[PDB]
């Protein structure tokens, strides 16, 4: 008797790529993993601010000029009238509001999980960004394309085509090497999940970076094939754990 | 009836500064916190390789030339004949070998703790290094001084006196800002320990960086006073939790 949660995500111009975002995938992973009923409302980049304002979703940050900056994912929960932005806030909301669903925040782990993503962001998200950003622009619909190109380039001071070198693959490998040695501190048979034998939001956050690569580059691309080869296939084994949680409603 | 564990540490030319090292303090904190009986064997920098070889302590890493590099802390446990190097390995050894002592590795936390120190090292250890490295050289005894200067400078390609600028305090503040926001994910009243209401090795690792600053710079220095002021005194409150675990046997 629960009404579907409305989940706001950014579409693409090809069905296989409809769900592509690294941050929106954090929320889709949580929704899927927790087994909550939802529907995706697909929102183009330049329409994000408008939709947020229209539903009372807060902005998640300020621009360099101090002006409000609105981002997805956002969810609207008809069952409680909650409207929540930012994937971390959304995860904790769902944990708290649907306590019967599978837990992603075991006690005493919230700082550790937060710190983990602070390590992953610069060392894994940033290299993957450089690797895929041109192909991201390519998979977006036209109104989204102009907004995306204009924003990212203004920030990067560089044409999108001029980003994405071999230095990025080196940096990615090094960041993953540190995550690999962290996982290994759990000991053999426990070294594919941060807590060894259960999934946390932090694991899904890492997976979100990986699936962003796979969807942007293409599951059959040389780039994805190269990723699956890193560290004797460890991240292939990592991602295989989350295959059942990748449903997209298109 | 337990015999004291022998703990190898690097001395200084002033009693207040005898225990100064960021890594050796990780082991001293663990020994103190766990309430284990120990004695410090004080070993000068150039004598570390010799002492290690003499007691069967392994090297913890290789130099750029691939040659073995021996470091302290090391412990020798007469009760089991164990000789263990590297502060992480030493902590886990003590956890495992003395299970009745206060726990520092709760289940499911080993990867999270490892990842946390990977975040702290570049963002907190490295800025503090730049800040104190000249005063570190200053507090060492003469044979240690030459070794320390020669090694660090060969690595830094810069005289020790030319290191330590305002950029370092900015970088330190930014690294601590990220750790601060991680701790705050635990919620109010739980935001001074990574797990909120218990101490882990990861907390002691952060404390080791802080006490290194305090001992190197001096508890009364402007630099230590400045550290205690950062973030409305949060790190002062953090360090106050570990005051009872700072016994030094000099």
Residue numbers in the entry:
A (entry chain A), B (entry chain A): 2 to 251
What's the paper's own text on this?
Glutathione transferases (GSTs; EC 2.5.1.18) constitute a large superfamily of multifunctional enzymes that are involved in phase II of xenobiotic detoxification by catalyzing the conjugation of glutathione (GSH) to a variety of electrophilic compounds. Most of the GSTs are dimeric proteins, each monomer harbouring two domains : a thioredoxin N-terminal domain containing the conserved GSH binding site (G site) and a more variable C-terminal α-helical domain (H site) usually involved in the binding of the GSH acceptor compound. As assumed in our recent report PcGSTFuA2, PcGSTFuA3 and PcGSTFuA1 share the same structure, which contains distinctive features when compared with canonical GST structure: (i) a new mode of dimerization, (ii) an original β-hairpin (β2’β2’’) that inhibits the formation of the regular GST dimer and acts as a lid over the G-site and (iii) a supplementary helix (α4’), between helices α4 and α5, that closes the presumed H-site.
The structure of PcGSTFuA3 was solved at high resolution (2.1 Å) from crystals having the P6122 space group with one polypeptide chain in the asymmetric unit. Structural superpositions of apo/holo PcGSTFuA1, PcGSTFuA2 and PcGSTFuA3 unambiguously showed that PcGSTFuA2 and PcGSTFuA3 are in the holo conformation in the conditions used. In PcGSTFuA3, three formate ions mimic the binding of the two GSH carboxylate groups and of the GSH thiolate group. A fourth formate molecule occupies the position of the sulphate ion in PcGSTFuA1. The distance plot, which compares holo PcGSTFuA1 and PcGSTFuA3, revealed a significant difference in the β1-α1 loop. The consequence is an increase in the number of intermolecular hydrogen bonds from 5 (in PcGSTFuA1 dimer) to 12 (in PcGSTFuA3) leading to a more stable dimer. In the active site, Ser-22 (PcGSTFuA1 numbering), which catalyses the GSH addition on ITC in PcGSTFuA1, is present in PcGSTFuA2 but absent in PcGSTFuA3.
